[PDB]
Amino acid sequence: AKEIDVSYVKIEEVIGAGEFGEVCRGRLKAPGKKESCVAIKTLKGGYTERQRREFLSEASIMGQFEHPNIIRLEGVVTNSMPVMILTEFMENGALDSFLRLNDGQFTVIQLVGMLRGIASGMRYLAEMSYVHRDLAARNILVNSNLVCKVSDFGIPIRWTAPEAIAFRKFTSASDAWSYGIVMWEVMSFGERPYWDMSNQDVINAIEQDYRLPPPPDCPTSLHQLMLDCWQKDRNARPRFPQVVSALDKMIRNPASLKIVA
Ligand SMILES: CCN1CCC(Nc2ccc3c(c2)/C(=C(\c2ccccc2)c2nc4cc(OC)ccc4[nH]2)C(=O)N3)CC1
C-alpha cells in the first residue's frame, strides 16, 4: 500500500547487518512532506522468489500496526532493484547491546520505563491477536529519548515457554514468558539468559523448577513479576494489560522499588 519512488531515498551509511543483507541509515523526502530520517533494509542480487516474499512479509505485517512502542513502516521499494524496506531510524540501536554499553548507568525508574514501553507494545500486539514468537532484547530498538520499540516481524530456546518448545503451541501467554526473560535481560544490563548453559541444560532445569535468580540490585517486586511470567501453567501467567498496570504501580509508588533481599 506504501510503494515509494526510488528517487525519494538517499542511502547514507551502513549501520548493521540483518539476516538477508545490509542495514543503512538514510533520508526520505517525498513532494509536499518534510524530510525525515529512516533505517533502510536491503536485499542485493542473488535470491529465490520465496526468499523475496519472506523479506517483504516483514513489511506487510508491520504496515498493519500503529503504536508508539511498535517500529513504524515508512514504505517499500519493490518495482526496482535493490529491493528495500524503509522503517524508522532508532539512534541507540538494539536494546541488549545499548544496555551493556551503558552498564550500571541508568536508574531503576528509567529501566522500568523501558520495560513498560515494551509491555505496552506487547499489550497492543496481543489485542490485535498477533503472537510474536521471538520476543527478546535483541529485537527491541531504542531511540534518542530512550523509547523502546518492538521490531523483528516476518527457535530461540532460552526465550521460549516450555509448552511452546514441546508442542509448538505459541500464544500471547508464551510471549509473556519471553517478556519475563526480557525483564531479566533489561535489569541485568544485557547479560545473556542462563549464562553458561546449553539449550537442553536450560530445558532440563526449567522442567525441574529452576528459575533465573534476581539480577544484582533488582527490586523484589520486579523479580516476582518475572516469576509470575515463568509459571509452568500458561493460564496463570499475567496477561499484558496486567503487566503494564503492575509496572505503572511501581512508577507511581517509587518507594516500592527500594526494597531488595
Ligand atoms: C536479528 C535482529 N534484528 C533486529 C532488528 C533489525 N531491523 C532493524 C529495523 C529498523 C532499524 C534497525 C534494525 C536499526 C539498527 C540495527 C540494525 C541491525 C541490527 C540491529 C539494529 C541500528 N543499529 C544501530 C547502531 C548504532 O550504533 C550504536 C546506532 C543506531 C543503530 N540503529 C535502526 O536504527 N532501525 C533486523 C535484525
**133 near 172, Cβ under 8 Å?**
no
DSSP state of 37: E
Cα–Cα dist 261/259, whole Å: 7
Is the shortest distance between the CB of 160 and ligand 1 below 6 Å?
Answer: no
- What was the elucidation method? X-ray
3-state DSSP call for residue 206?
helix
Distance 6 CA to ligand 1 centre (A): 22
- Domain ranges (residues) in the chain: 1-89, 90-257
The rounded distance, in Å, linking the Cα atoms of 161 and 170 is 8
Separation of alpha carbons 182 and 115, rounded Å: 8
Q: Whose CA is nearest to atom 17 of ligand 1?
A: 16
Q: Can you read off the three cell numbers belonging to residue 247?
A: 509496572
| Residue of 134, 146, 135, 141 lying closest to 94 (CA atoms) | 141
Q: Please classify residue 131 by burial: count the beta carbons closer than 10 Å to its beta carbon, then call 0-12 exposed, 13-18 middle and 19+ buried.
A: middle
Domain boundaries 90-257, corresponding CATH code: 1.10.510.10
Q: What's the CA gap between 131 and 238, in Å, rounded?
A: 15
The finding on whether 42 has its CB within 6 A of some atom of ligand 1 is no
Residue 134 is a catalytic residue: yes
Q: What is the CATH number of domain 1-89?
A: 3.30.200.20
The string of DSSP letters for 78-135 reads -SSSSEEEEEE--TT-BHHHHHHHTTT-S-HHHHHHHHHHHHHHHHHHHHTT---S--
Cα Rg of the chain, angstroms: 19
CA of 244 relative to ligand 1 center, distance in Å = 25
Same fold for the domain at 1-89 and the one at 90-257?
Answer: no
